[model samples]
Target: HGYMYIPSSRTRLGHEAGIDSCPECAILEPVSSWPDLDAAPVGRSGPCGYNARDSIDYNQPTTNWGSDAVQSYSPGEEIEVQWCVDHNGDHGGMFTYRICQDQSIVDKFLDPSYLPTNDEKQAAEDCFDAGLLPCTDVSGQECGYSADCTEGEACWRNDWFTCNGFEASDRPKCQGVDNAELNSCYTSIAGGYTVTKKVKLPEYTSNHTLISFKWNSFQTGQIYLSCADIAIQ
Candidate 1:
């Protein structure tokens, strides 16, 4: 979402991104609470739960509904959501991209096989409020609210990120994100690296929606998730 990286030559889950995962593509687990998005590295997830759902869907939401990567956006489109430094490399954290305009909370994952239970996925994450990517909607960047970080930085700003201040990888122990290698922390042997974000799409009108993408892993206690399939045109 906000940490932008899509170079598998126009990656949209044609596979080979940074983890060869499929669901509109991108899967790197271990930090748990996932809710079975075909469960390869997902099951029992929470940090932004949406009323918690998952009574049925283990897959077949009309053929695994995520990284088929077909994209769309235009209620106020001004995008840039890359972050593929080597097909999902980078253990540092901090990411965003949110758009659930509540078509009954994106109609509970658009059916397919159906999933949503932890209180209907926390009531669709309190009706899509967890999809927050605002630092005044980002421009030159310096996002906010980790209550203005200290103890040596990382209030999670974003000119695309930079948390290099070694006290054993600082910034709230990398949960707010920053594993050095700077600027989106580009890694995987510098043979690849990326991180960019220029977001601005929240006029909140929708014929369909669900663009949530979140990450909160610095070194692991993991919390990376993804979702896409939109229409705010």
Candidate 2:
């Protein structure tokens, strides 16, 4: 009773190329149709193509009967009807009347199977973490050890290291980065070492939105970054 549209891909020749390497493409097939019946007979007809009936009492008046007429009803209407029968000179029987209601009525509907669940929540959390911490930051507080600075030029102090044009707050705000020895080692061994005096990781503050992650770094190397807008719990 209904038709569905299917999309298909095709390749075409390029302009001014004379001929394109692309191949010919085909479209989707047509949809099928359902059957709908208009009318159907229920009872039998007489010899003359008409129904015949008899009276209940032979001593009384005779009666003639014909096939019942077909009827149509709306989807939500109640149906009630009575039918009677008779034999020569005597009453045979009668059908009682009763209201009939259709149970397949339409109403608001929802599919529970398609609804979101707890697993979706966990997946979103994992995705958020992936978008936030892509890789570890190893270039300690101050840029590489080759960085120029005076003897008392804010050297390493209290697990914090200093670099030219870069403040301690520029690095990731993690306790692990507060180690002086590790910071010194990274600066000395790491190439293009630079400090992120301020780093803000992306986060999900609500169920439908993603917050931006901002940071200031004293680096001279290529940086790779990515973001994802994911649903959160």
Predicted structure with the largest TM-score when compared to the true one: 1
lDDT of 1 by residue, 1-233 (tens): 12223321212332223332322223334443222111223343322221122122221133434323346577666666655443233454455555655677557655755655555554554454455545456566655433323434443344223323213334432322322244443333333334455667787766556655555444444444545555666
TM-score of 1: 0.30
lDDT for each residue of candidate 2 in 1-233, tens digit (9 for 90 to 100): 00000000001111012222211111111211001000111111100111112111100111111111123233222222111001110111000111111111100001112322334322332333343321122223232321222344332121222223222344322212332222221111121111123212222222222211111112321111111111223
Residue 82 of model 2 has an lDDT of: 11
Candidate number with greatest lDDT = 1
List the candidate 2 regions with Cα displacement exceeding 4 Å: 1-177, 180-208, 221-224, 228-233
Give the Cα RMSD of candidate 1: 16.3
lDDT of each: 0.42, 0.18
